Design a protein around this ligand. Structure first.
Ligand code: FES
Ligand code: FES
Ligand code: FES
Ligand code: FES
Ligand SMILES: [Cl-]
Ligand SMILES: [Cl-]
Ligand SMILES: [Cl-]
Ligand SMILES: [Cl-]
Ligand SMILES: [Cl-]
Ligand SMILES: [Cl-]
Ligand SMILES: [Mg+2]
Ligand SMILES: [Mg+2]
Ligand SMILES: [Mg+2]
Ligand SMILES: [Mg+2]
Ligand SMILES: [Mg+2]
Ligand SMILES: [Mg+2]
Ligand code: NA
Ligand code: NA
Ligand code: NA
Ligand code: NA
Lengths: 907, 907
């Protein structure tokens, strides 16, 4: 050990440290500076950025031996605090740069380092700086972060007054549609919002820290578990196995389709008879620290009989394949789509036909914050779980039978969380922590490292697809045929539903009267499927939007004009036979057209012999809702202090559940003149908030926004005074009148898609958009650079523009990754951010352009649709179409790795 | 466990707690708010004061179940921070209210609570508030704290501008003699100075926490130790016993007098053959937490043969008594005093003689911070100890042979510390933590609780005394006889030296030509003797100053006038035959006289039948130095940034080592125009600071102040430019000239007192004072209230008036405790603050008056003497003399408990 006397955030610290200890651990654990966020732990994400003697360093890869006596360190806590915000923090809030907020401290500290060395950076200087310092963001697409740095710099430079970094209320007083900052922003930009790992550090002594004993093969029969060496190791309390589970030790898919061949009870909590994928949790070590638990987990010995593993859909679907779940065929679900007339004769007599085979793979979510959860037994006898769940009520029912609790004896709460992008539509760690809390009686905390986040959370499910179009010479679509095979890994939850998405979205955007297709879901031993932003659309629409360009090529037609010819207009129906609710695609195409033509001309002018430029188009469509007559509930309550609490379980991945609540409520409450800062939101809790439903399917703004609107309308009625005006809390309580008022809303016009035909009216609101990608391909290396993305978006009406702009930029960036760099195929190589192709700032163009072409929705609150998943529906198709425009080569199987593009260029 | 969402220091906290947990632990350990100080842990000291929902509460006795959802908590961190100080914090700094600083956060938070309820309190309102809220201070005597509250209130009320709470530099630029604030004040008032327990919380995981296995009988032969049950208990690493000690397992007294009958090696580190007092440490449990170590220590079984214990000096000194240290007589030292002619014949022929038997007991130091230390093995192979040592070099040599290290392989460092008042002139925990660090190889931390602070740190040693005076009718003293028996408990360190103090100080202040006396030191089984502020003078001068009043009474002379007749004047010598260096007692008496006469008249006028008022006088004298030719060393270094570091081992109990250094250096550096904020001090460290010596004997201002002066004079010479002016650092380094310059100083005129006669010149500088106490005695209950104290003080020249005023107020308050309420006689009953008679604010009068009558010392730096121990030399004699004045009764044996006074009143 060594004494080091240094200054941290301007205050002398008399530190006692191991010279080999990591600065991140010292700052977070010894000094309580949990504003230093840790994600990857490998120097790749920048979340742990601190200033050390004028240099921005990653604290997770800086050992204390590198910190000199008398060193100066600054963390986010030294940049500024609530009510003493630095210009960078104020700018972040104003520009909406904190979505999940997990990267915000690190970007802000890094930016202070930049501005201390270059007071007047260009936007490119800012981008170069964040590239060099490895500041990674998965939510924002980087543009808002650069915007914030530039604004702060202007203020620090005296070019602009600091008051201009503070939001100015619009003249109309309306926050609906405005850039009003989100309530959680201040906490996020000051490092004072506690995420799950932060909470772990602040839990009491005697909290047990868990480590997973995980399968290191992909498929096996388990013969035994020996914990004897582990029990002797430092700090170890006990080891938990399936024998300690008090219920069924299975997670239920809950809404497993009747025509699924499996019962939906396939997924264990702790493996008992079998390993089904690499990473499966076989045991939990409980210890006094994460470090001691992990060390001991390495000594637990599992005796396995390894089995041949099926690592792709086609392998597992072979007629000869051995059943992974004995008694259930590996191909456990099929969904037909049968619209209109038989397609065979139409293809035979059509002027033109096209066909393609396409692939979209196992995209990894890559939030900056790896999975983390904790649980404890309450003083009331219930088991409490606090996690990254984005469907607390859903997950309660998925896990309660398995853990052996009745639903009223378990409570799930959503912690503040650093992104999910859908992986948390699935249970991950909740059942594990519940079992351990129940077995020990003690609080327990489980933090995944980044390798576990990659290997042992669910993934976008790969689809192998064949799609065909028949059309007239004038471009009018006549018929479509489709086939898709969904590799869902070993756990069935929502796999049938994901497969149904192919019937709904392959070919969406156009009038196609005649469709014959079939989706099939297959169990494999690769990573299990969890929702990933777009949930079936990125697969489906990659195929159909690439195939539209192939059709245009075969006709000698411009691909934007081919889309214009076929786009939904009154009278048309979507693939499930339902009429669209608004018709904005022609409007959006007409408004895009001159920008597309100019982009084509620029690409022609600026292309060189070696660097070929191209422009690509695609359409995106997706539902806002879960299928059928989805519903939500909210409670609007006048509090004694005159504030109003809007109680919901609107789960916040980081997308803006807080501001969606406040903005929607504000608009609904305008007759009573309620200031936005007087409106409070509630963190999701299954005991004390209503069943608003999960934040999946881009649904909350529509479903919960409507429930909030109704609850607020009902509160206004409850407060109305005879003769005009409104009663105060005191007046209502004195008259023994209610102050907490319910509202509910149901999408009553919706119906589930049929099991035989796929036809129905699954959503009452959809999101519609048109993408344009501008790219450059280096034909010597095959490397593609995306120079610009544009989204024409019809969101009906904006609840909050900081929220929607940010959602779109973030989705576009994930689309660039999906197109060019991302996959989870190689269990070890793709288990790091850099290994799996995470998009760092230079991969995302500064030119991300949005044009809102909003057609108010009949059933949306104040006309709103969702936004969340729209920007990932097909940006990757636009990008691949742009590579084709540039070079003549078509990549059918994502991602467009440089060598793959080169091979195609040279064939 | 329960989730509680509350606000702490204005920030929402999502807390997870045990409902039974103490708020102090939650705030300090879970939230890192080490500004909440914990001392007593029993709700008696107020150090842990926090504001909870507008009420000031003691966090150490507030369980989390009392903290409601939505509660608001404020700690010192929420009051203000460095560079954002609250008016109360600024006022504390300006008024010098932070000496050790350990109580400062709690008083400030408590005061904010006061001012939030009563914006314009009277001084009595402030006192009533601190009484009610149990805010205890052992350093300041409370008056400076009340001063600070009143000043802050005026500012908060708009009656006075906030800028007036900031120090204004004197016109002359001189900080010597000024009220310049001490460097450490800001950290203390903001809770950002880490004391030893705070450091423990900020040490790395894998630091082991120690608990002592202690004797629960006073005297025994040890037969065995069974650790078997303890080793099985939660979190336990190991148990350390004497078998793990690598050296002699004894602490050496180091400077044991040759005529001592013992070898000075009597004190074990870990008991091996015997228990010598209740509380002796027999083993150390090492565990993952203090709580787990303590729980396991309760299960360690010690097999003992209890022996009869001698619990007082007279019992142990009986001719028949069994030797506690076999081979050494219990009476192990005698010091004669033989001055002038044989006293028998002088007593026989004198006009008047008086005699008395007096007792001063086992006063407990009662710092607000209980003892704490830690140790580790450095990367350099040395063993480092960080403790409350106020003599780091001294303690290194006292313990190194016992722990089995050569002196260069051990390093002792003084942590910031919450008071000692001399107990840390002794080793307490240093050898214990060293043994454990060496045995385990791991960092180790040991915190005493308040019961252990009381039972198992050293104490003022009781003296049983008989003193006699012979005098002429006109009051001229002719001769003195003295006998004293010093109960030193079982451990000899500095016991012989303490006994020699009786030869030096019994009768000090007056010309007494003929003296015959004898002091004897005896080992007992009550608590071992450690220095307590005044170190022999409080005992010695209680006897002689009470006896002077008895002489005055027998002569029918006024007791101030009797002192005036006899006080040192040129030509006189002190009891050791040495001439005083200055002669200020007559001056001080002349200046006190009219205030004494007015006080007498007030007492006469204001006395009633039931409440009798009186006025008492005493003189105090004490040396500044350790005996003989004491010395110190300092290094003055010009740093590259133009600051100057003054390197010393001036140990800070809280008295002001920081400001003594800065003020003395500033004065010495004035020719070069060095601003005070440019002068840095060094925390004591045996490896990297010079052997400046211990902060004992009121010596540092004289010894180390002179060394600092010399080092600074030498730095000026090193920086002088030919032709006038001074070179910069850059100019000196370029010329390859030295920048770090030594200075030393020795009290060359001093000699040790003779072993046969007691004569010598032990100190070259003394401190001189005259006390006046004003009291009221309720003759129905025997309760005495001290209504006022005055000290006429000759300190030569003031380095810093905030420091000296505070030292005097603090010493006067300890004198009130010594006189009226304090003892450590009953091992259990006196093991709490309240049980042992700690003076809370209402026991200390707001009227504490100082008059400086400074006679510059020939050998002091800029004329300064010490101050530290002067105010405790005899205030308790003045108080007892005032009780006699008021009521006619004399208390001979302290303390003057009400029942004791009543018994005397009624006899
Ligand atoms: S770079 Fe440190 S946590 Fe990712
Ligand atoms: S806001 Fe950047 S990772 Fe979420
Ligand atoms: S009153 Fe809480 S530590 Fe003393
Ligand atoms: S300053 Fe109050 S206890 Fe030391
Ligand atoms: Cl057909
Ligand atoms: Cl391909
Ligand atoms: Cl490649
Ligand atoms: Cl004699
Ligand atoms: Cl008495
Ligand atoms: Cl009493
Ligand atoms: Mg500022
Ligand atoms: Mg038509
Ligand atoms: Mg190749
Ligand atoms: Mg202020
Ligand atoms: Mg004389
Ligand atoms: Mg009695
Ligand atoms: Na901590
Ligand atoms: Na792993
Ligand atoms: Na802590
Ligand atoms: Na004890």
């Amino acid at each position: 050990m060594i004494q080091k006397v240094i200054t941290v955030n301007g205050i002398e610290q008399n530190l006692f440290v191991d010279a080999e200890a990591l600065l991140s651990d010292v700052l977070r654990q010894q000094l309580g500076l949990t504003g230093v966020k840790v994600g990857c732990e490998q120097g790749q994400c920048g979340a742990c950025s601190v200033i050390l003697d004028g240099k921005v360093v990653r604290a997770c890869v800086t050992k204390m031996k590198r910190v000199a006596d008398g060193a100066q360190i600054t963390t986010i806590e030294g940049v500024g605090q609530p009510e003493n915000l630095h210009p960078l923090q104020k700018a972040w809030v104003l520009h909406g740069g904190a979505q999940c907020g997990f990267c915000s401290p690190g970007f802000i500290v890094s930016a202070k380092g930049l501005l201390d060395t270059n007071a007047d950076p260009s936007r490119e200087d800012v981008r170069d700086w964040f590239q060099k310092h490895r500041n990674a963001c998965r939510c924002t697409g980087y543009k808002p972060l650069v915007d914030a740095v530039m604004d702060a710099a202007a203020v620090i430079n005296g070019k602009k007054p600091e008051t201009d970094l503070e939001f100015k209320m619009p003249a109309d007083g309306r926050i609906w549609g405005s850039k009003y900052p989100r309530p959680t922003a201040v906490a996020k930009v000051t490092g004072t919002l506690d995420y799950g790992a932060d909470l772990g550090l602040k839990m009491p002594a005697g909290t047990l820290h868990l480590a997973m004993v995980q399968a290191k093969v992909s498929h096996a029969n388990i013969k035994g578990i020996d914990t004897s060496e582990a029990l002797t190791m430092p700090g170890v309390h006990s080891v938990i196995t399936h024998k300690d589970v008090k219920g069924k030790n299975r997670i239920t898919g809950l809404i497993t389709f009747p025509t699924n061949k499996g019962d939906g009870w396939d997924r264990p909590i702790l493996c008992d008879e079998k390993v089904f994928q690499y990473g499966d949790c076989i045991a939990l070590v409980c210890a006094d620290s994460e470090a001691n638990a992990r060390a001991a987990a390495e000594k637990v010995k599992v005796d396995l009989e390894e089995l041949p593993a099926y690592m792709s859909g086609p392998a597992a679907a072979a007629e000869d394949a051995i059943e992974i779940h004995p008694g259930t065929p590996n191909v456990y679900f099929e969904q037909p789509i049968v619209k209109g007339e038989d397609t065979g004769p139409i293809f035979a007599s059509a002027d033109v036909t096209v066909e393609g085979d396409f692939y979209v793979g196992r995209q990894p979510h890559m939030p900056i914050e790896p999975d983390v959860a904790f649980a404890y037994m309450g003083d009331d006898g219930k088991c409490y779980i606090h996690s990254k769940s984005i469907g607390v009520h859903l997950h309660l029912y998925m896990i309660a039978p398995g853990v052996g609790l009745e639903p009223d004896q378990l409570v799930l709460v959503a912690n503040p969380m650093g992104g999910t992008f859908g992986y948390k539509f699935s249970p991950t760690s909740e059942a594990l922590v519940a079992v351990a809390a129940m077995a020990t009686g003690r609080p327990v905390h489980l933090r995944y490292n980044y390798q576990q986040q990659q290997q042992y959370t669910g993934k976008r499910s790969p689809w192998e697809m064949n799609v065909k179009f028949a059309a007239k010479k004038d471009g009018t679509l006549l018929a479509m045929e489709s086939d898709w095979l969904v590799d869902h890994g070993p756990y069935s939850e929502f796999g049938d539903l994901l497969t149904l998405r192919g019937a709904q979205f392959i070919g969406a955007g156009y009038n196609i009267p005649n469709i014959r297709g079939l989706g099939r879901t297959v169990a494999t031993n690769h990573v299990w499927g969890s929702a990933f932003r777009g949930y079936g659309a990125p697969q489906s629409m990659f195929a159909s939007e690439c195939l539209m360009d192939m059709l245009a090529e075969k006709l000698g037609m411009d691909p934007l004009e081919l889309r214009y010819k076929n786009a939904y207009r009154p009278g048309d129906t979507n693939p499930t036979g339902q009429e669209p609710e608004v018709f904005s695609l022609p409007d959006m195409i007409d408004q895009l057209r001159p920008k597309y033509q100019a982009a084509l001309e620029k690409a022609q002018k600026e292309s060189t012999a070696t660097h070929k430029k191209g422009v690509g188009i695609s359409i995106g469509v997706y539902g806002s809702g879960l299928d059928g007559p989805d519903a939500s509930e909210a409670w609007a309550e006048l509090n004694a202090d005159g504030t109003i609490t809007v109680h919901t379980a609107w789960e916040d991945h980081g997308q803006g559940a807080d501001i969606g609540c406040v903005g929607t409520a504000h608009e609904a409450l305008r007759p009573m003149g309620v200031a936005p800062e007087k409106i409070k939101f509630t963190w999701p809790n299954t005991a004390t908030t209503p069943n608003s439903g999960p934040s999946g399917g881009s649904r909350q703004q529509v479903m919960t926004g409507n429930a909030i609107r109704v609850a607020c309308e009902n509160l206004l009625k409850a407060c109305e005074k005879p003769g005009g005006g409104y009663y105060t809390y005191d007046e209502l309580k004195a008259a023994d009148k209610p102050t907490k008022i319910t509202g509910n809303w149901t999408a009553s016009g919706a119906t589930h898609c049929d099991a035989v035909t796929g036809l129905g009216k699954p959503f009452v609101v959809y999101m519609y958009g048109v993408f344009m990608a501008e790219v450059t391909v280096d034909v010597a290396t095959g490397q593609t650079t995306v120079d610009g993305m544009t989204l024409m978006a019809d969101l009906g009406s904006l609840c909050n523009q900081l929220a929607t702009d940010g959602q779109i930029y973030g989705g576009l960036a994930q689309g660039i990754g999906l197109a060019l760099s991302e996959d989870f195929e190689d269990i070890k190589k793709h288990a790091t951010l850099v290994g799996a192709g995470f998009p760092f700032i230079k991969q995302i163009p500064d030119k991300l352009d949005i044009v809102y072409v909003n057609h108010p929705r009949p059933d949306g609150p104040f006309g709103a649709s969702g936004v969340g998943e729209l920007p990932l529906t097909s940006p990757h198709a636009a990008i691949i179409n742009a590579i084709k425009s540039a070079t003549g080569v078509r990549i059918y199987r994502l991602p467009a790795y440089p060598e793959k593009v080169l091979e195609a260029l040279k064939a």
